[PDB]
Amino acid sequence: VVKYPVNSELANYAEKFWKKELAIYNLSLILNKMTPFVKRRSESYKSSLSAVKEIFKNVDDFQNFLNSVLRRSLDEYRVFFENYERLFNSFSSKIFSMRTKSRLVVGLGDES
RNA sequence: AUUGAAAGUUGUAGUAUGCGGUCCUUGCG
């Protein structure tokens, strides 16, 4: 039971897309607006990330779907990055690059 | 049968010139 709290036509469109049938590219749009409420048996329609993972075939499957959706915007991200680097160089700013020692999370407490 | 009868405070004329809602601050234990 993946009933959505959105008007019926967008509800069925989101249902169609959610089962890896379409190629919606804005990951934020999928996550924020068309939220897949899950009503697993013997329980009300919860909305936690655990239920969302239960909707997908496996945790790896959900991770792959998210990675694909994120990677789908590569060209736009590249153009934006070129503009950003041009801005950095234009203002005469020192730029460097590091890497994450371990896992990172910023703004975990943002309310959703 | 009177210091009386008579006479448009009226014409033109831009509340206008200058000015950054800005500074400080980890969404987190």
Brief overview:
This protein is mainly alpha-helical and 112 residues long. Helix content is 51%, strand content 0%. It is elongated and about 60 Å long.
Description:
It is classed as rna binding protein/rna/dna. The entry lists the keywords Type III-B CRISPR-Cas effector, RNA binding protein, RNA BINDING PROTEIN-RNA-DNA complex. The entry is titled "Target analog-bound type III-B Cmr complex of Archaeoglobus fulgidus". The protein: CRISPR type III-associated protein domain-containing protein. The organism is Archaeoglobus fulgidus DSM 4304. The protein is mainly α and about 110 residues long. About 50% of the residues lie in helices and about 0% in strands. The protein has five helices and no strands. The protein has helices at about 10-20, 25-30, 50-55, 60-70, 75-90. The longest helix has 17 residues, at about 75-90. It is elongated, with a radius of gyration of 18 Å.
Features:
part of a larger assembly, 1 chains, 112 residues, mainly alpha, elongated, RNA-binding, CRISPR type III-associated protein domain-containing protein
Distance between the termini: 21 Å
Helix run count: 5
Q: What coarse outline follows from CA principal-axis ratios?
A: elongated
Which strand-content bin applies to the residues?
under 5%
Order of helices and strands: HHHHH
Rg from Cα: 18 Å
Structural class by secondary-structure content: mainly alpha
Largest sheet: none
The tally of strands reads: 0
> What's the helical proportion of residues?
40-55%
